């Protein structure tokens, strides 16, 4: 449909990627439709799409279902006017040109059926005459033109009666007119203020939202926190909201019904219907208007919010799934308890358990010097690199532990990282960590899973459920339906960047493949095990169900390593091996040759290889492939980092951690000591996440702050620290 790719291609343009064509987008469109997945697209299918990547596909695909409900809404309201002879060409236009729910919805609120309400008992018992007269000529009496209209158990015999039945006709018919609905639902978007009351009872038990007893703010400008902090009031709530445009004055007219008046023309001018109008206007505002308009803008507002924290949620998780994996390297897992103990766990370069044990370093069984030996034996049996440290309770205790073991055996060669031990305690209490490991209790399942993580913390985090890796600070206050459906999304992006090798993949892992899922992965992990490792990709077309569709969206994603065919270990698809090979045969070379040669391949023309279906990016993207294979587009785990007690500018290395002390603070900035003999100057704007003023005001001499090294220099032997967020060196 065009009015879809046009608006999906015009909410795309306004994207730093910049303009975007309808084109595309119809192109993407259709291949999504076909179920070709957004990794897919974004990889191989460049040419079709003008190059649209997973950022905009992601998008596409978000706005594509948000349009298609609108589309398939605006046809049911058309459908049901016209049904009712009342579609007007001029209506039918209004209904073409509304871009938003809202404004479909409230263009058919006239047409929209109800029965009984009090305007339509009023007007079947004839009221109407004298809501239209009244309203036609503000000069008439009311009781008077009231008197005719007594109905005698028609439900209406007193004038009073009489009256209030015409009230509710006009009340309802002011209600539903879409010209002010609009007026007011603007205008209350820019003055009314979203008001936050603590309920009766004075509850302490709302101590949360403390913050919010007495709390009024701007609607245009409620912070998304803040908003959903106020609606967590909800069900049984210790919380009022409501907006309220001005000061609660009565005796004043509400800026709203001067606007209602307004709109139909209804000055107070001492005439004799006058006051029963201004009491319509009233009625009209405080019983429909009111409500309607602060549900709208209530969920418009709480929509924004739950979004734009959904929209940090799924950045902190990309993130995390994207974080540098330290390597197969045999590493030693250690949850540091106090309480129970400290749970080791040791596992060799495969990820694959080799030991575990419980020390108890700590306090209420003190064994520092036990522990140690306990350690050392284990690293020195396993052949221990690293030691991975859950940043849980004790974890101050325990690094001090790590830190000293590897000054005491400096013969092993370690180095401790600390890992975070959120996603651990998750997957101990799994019933996936059952499965793996039954002969052990619950609480050496976390050390295992905190090695595993150093090694490979996608691998790891990917074996639970996305929301439970923790992925911000009160999650449970949004959506979890929007919530699942955009981690899943960050999760796919992930694991389809990295890759996956297909034989030490777990089921977890595969699940999360393009074109894969929870059977499928299963089938191949089974097939894997029965039939043992696949030497080719082509042998995956042997795996029950994965058929010729799931192949395409799955192969160039799930990597062979150390096969029969040196490209089952790239991204370049199957689809284009023949391809390939006529570039090998034009080289008159071997694949195998080809790969690491950068300067050969750089001086290959990829337009000579192109074609109808395989073009410039392509070709492009296969050539950077022959040169490294599935390159990992992780940042690059560093060893030289984490390495504590460095006393030299020598051993300093351009992105390390150090704790130092302000030597001086000045008017530019400040000067630290890291203890290697020369101060680094923390620059001034280098001193704060954010603006810095006054270097004075952030810092003082004696303060021992957490700085970063950036920008070391031998020669000139300086060092620069930043002291910041950014951590982008020269």
């Not at 015999?157 to 603007?186: P, Q, S």
Request: aromatic residues 6%; negative net charge.
């Amino acid at each position: 449909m065009d009015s879809i790719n046009t608006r999906i291609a015009e909410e795309l343009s306004a994207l730093p990627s910049g303009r975007v064509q309808p084109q595309q987008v119809a192109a993407a469109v259709a291949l999504l439709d076909e179920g070709s997945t957004v990794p897919f697209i974004a990889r191989y299918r460049k040419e079709v799409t003008g190059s649209l990547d997973d950022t905009q596909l992601r998008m596409l695909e978000e706005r594509l279902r948000y349009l298609r409900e609108l589309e398939e809404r605006r046809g049911a309201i058309l459908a049901s006017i016209e049904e009712q002879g009342k579609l007007t060409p001029e209506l039918a236009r209004d209904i073409k040109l509304a871009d938003t729910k809202t404004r479909l919805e409230d263009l058919y609120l006239p047409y929209k059926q109800k029965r009984r309400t009090k305007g339509q008992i009023a007007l079947e018992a004839g009221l109407g005459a004298l809501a239209d007269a009244l309203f036609d000529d503000p000069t008439l009496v009311p009781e008077s033109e009231a008197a005719r209209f007594v109905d005698a158990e028609k439900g209406f015999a007193d004038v009073k009666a009489v009256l209030e039945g015409a009230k509710y006709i006009l009340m309802e018919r002011f209600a539903e007119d879409a010209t002010l609905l609009d007026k007011l639902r603007v205008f209350m978007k820019n003055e009314a203020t979203l008001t936050a009351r603590v309920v009766p009872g004075k509850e302490q038990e709302g101590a949360k939202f403390s913050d919010y007893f007495e709390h009024d703010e701007p609607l245009k400008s409620a912070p998304s926190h803040r908003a959903l902090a106020i609606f967590r009031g909800r069900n049984e709530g210790v919380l009022s909201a409501s907006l309220k445009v001005g000061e609660e004055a009565p005796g004043t007219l509400h800026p709203c019904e001067v606007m209602i008046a307004e709109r139909f023309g209804l000055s107070n001018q001492g005439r004799a219907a006058d006051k029963w109008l201004a009491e319509v206007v009233r009625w009209t505002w405080k019983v429909k208007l009111y409500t309607h308009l602060e549900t709208d803008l209530f969920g418009e507002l709480r929509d924004g919010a739950e979004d734009e924290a959904i929209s940090v949620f799924a950045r902190n998780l990309h993130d995390l799934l994207l974080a540098a994996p330290a390597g197969p390297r045999a590493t030693l897992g250690l949850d540091p308890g106090l309480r129970t103990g400290v749970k080791v766990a040791v596992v060799d370069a495969t990820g694959k358990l080799l030991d575990t044990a419980t020390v108890y370093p700590h306090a209420p069984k003190n064994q520092w010097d036990q522990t140690l030996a306990v350690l050392a034996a284990l690293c020195a049996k396993h052949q221990v690199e690293l030691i991975a440290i859950g940043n849980g309770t004790a974890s101050r205790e325990t690094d001090k532990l790590a830190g000293e073991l590897i000054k005491k055996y400096p013969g092993m060669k370690l180095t401790k990282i600390m890992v975070s031990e959120a996603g651990a305690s998750v997957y101990s209490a799994s019933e996936l960590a059952a499965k793996e490991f039954p002969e052990l209790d619950v609480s050496l399942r976390g050390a295992v899973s905190i090695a595993r993580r150093l090694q490979d913390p996608l691998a790891e985090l990917v074996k639970i459920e996305p929301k439970s890796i923790g992925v911000g600070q009160y999650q449970h206050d949004v959506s979890q339906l929007k919530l699942a459906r955009s981690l899943d999304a960050v999760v796919e992006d992930c694991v389809n960047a990295v890759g996956v090798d297909v034989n030490t993949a777990s089921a977890a892992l595969l699940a999360r493949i393009s074109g894969l899922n929870s059977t499928l992965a299963q089938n191949i992990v089974a097939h894997r095990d029965a039939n043992g490792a696949f030497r080719t990709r082509d042998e995956l077309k042997k795996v029950s169900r994965l058929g010729e569709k799931t192949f395409e969206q799955a192969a160039g994603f799930l990597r062979v390593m150390n096969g029969d065919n040196p490209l089952d270990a790239s991204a370049v698809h199957p689809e284009t091996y023949p391809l390939v090979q006529r570039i090998a045969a034009d080289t008159e070379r071997d694949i195998r040759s080809l790969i690491g040669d950068s300067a050969f391949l750089k001086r290959l023309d990829p337009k000579k290889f192109t074609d109808e279906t395989f073009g410039l990016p392509t070709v492009t993207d296969i050539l950077k492939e022959l040169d490294k294979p599935g390159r990992d587009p992780r940042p690059e785990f560093k060893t030289a980092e984490f390495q504590e007690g460095v006393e030299s500018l020598k051993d300093l290395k351009p992105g390390m951690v150090l704790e130092g002390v302000v030597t001086n603070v000045t008017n530019f900035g400040a000067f630290v000591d890291i203890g290697v003999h020369q101060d680094g100057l923390v620059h001034i704007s280098a001193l704060s996440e954010k603006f810095v003023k006054d270097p004075y005001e952030v810092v003082k001499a004696g303060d021992i702050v957490k700085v970063k090294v950036m920008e070391v220099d031998i020669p000139r032997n300086r060092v620069g620290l930043s002291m910041r967020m950014s951590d982008t060196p020269g």
